[PDB]
């Protein structure tokens, strides 16, 4: 299909993320490629601006799942794949428990042959000694699943899961994702069944970087069907 042939081989990807956290404006430009024959993704970001004000692993969610390996007997489910290249729009709202949240929304399209994410970033309500804005959370990011299903009335789909993140101290700060995705065309879509995608994610640094960043090897599959 249409969409779905645009991502049988490797895809370069870019991303541009402009941020405000609590007045705390900031920017993120990534450069990686992705392959959904293998569900994978291989990006590196940098803080074009100085220092990134929130931990890495907390942007990890808002910096597309078009490149998650839908095997086979799912393909009729894959949303993502099926806007392609007009793209969709993906939002959400983030809670942090017991601190703020982060609104945000992106359009996801192509460009040429590169899939573009561009995204803007609205955090409130944090506190400024919390352990986003004081920087309290540990450089990983654990293996979750992430839930979805159809929204009919928005030709889209509606996502949720829940993130944790890793305290220093060895707790756990709780990040509740609501997330909604609907197209920008007016092409057909794909609207699925319920089911699951299977994440996993590396972050690590570059030894020769000097600026503030994240490089990042993400695996995603799709599951929960047959
Ligand atoms: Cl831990």
């Given at each position: ?81 099926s ?72 030709n ?27 197209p920008?065309?007016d092409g057909p879509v794909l ?36």
């Amino acid at each position: 299909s249409k969409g779905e042939e645009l991502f049988t081989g490797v895809v370069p990807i870019l991303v541009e993320l402009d941020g405000d956290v609590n007045g705390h404006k900031f920017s993120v430009s990534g450069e990686g490629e992705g392959d959904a024959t293998y569900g994978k993704l291989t990006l590196k970001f940098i803080c074009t601006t100085g220092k990134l004000p929130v931990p890495w692993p907390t942007l990890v969610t808002t910096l597309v799942q078009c490149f998650s390996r839908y095997p086979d007997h799912m393909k009729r489910h894959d949303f993502f794949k099926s806007a392609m290249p007009e793209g969709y729009v993906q939002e959400r709202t983030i809670f942090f428990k017991d601190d703020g949240n982060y609104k945000t929304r992106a359009e996801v399209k192509f460009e040429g042959d590169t899939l573009v994410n561009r995204i803007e970033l609205k955090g409130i309500d944090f506190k400024e000694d919390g352990n986003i804005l004081g920087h309290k959370l540990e450089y990983n990011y654990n293996s979750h699943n992430v839930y979805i299903m159809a929204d009919k009335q928005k030709n889209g789909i509606k996502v949720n899961f829940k993130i944790r993140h890793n305290i220093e101290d060895g707790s756990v700060q709780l990040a509740d994702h609501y997330q909604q995705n609907t197209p920008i065309g007016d092409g057909p879509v794909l609207l699925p069944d319920n089911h699951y995608l299977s994440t996993q994610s590396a972050l690590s640094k570059d030894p020769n970087e000097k600026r503030d960043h994240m490089v990042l090897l993400e695996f995603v599959t799709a599951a929960g069907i047959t």
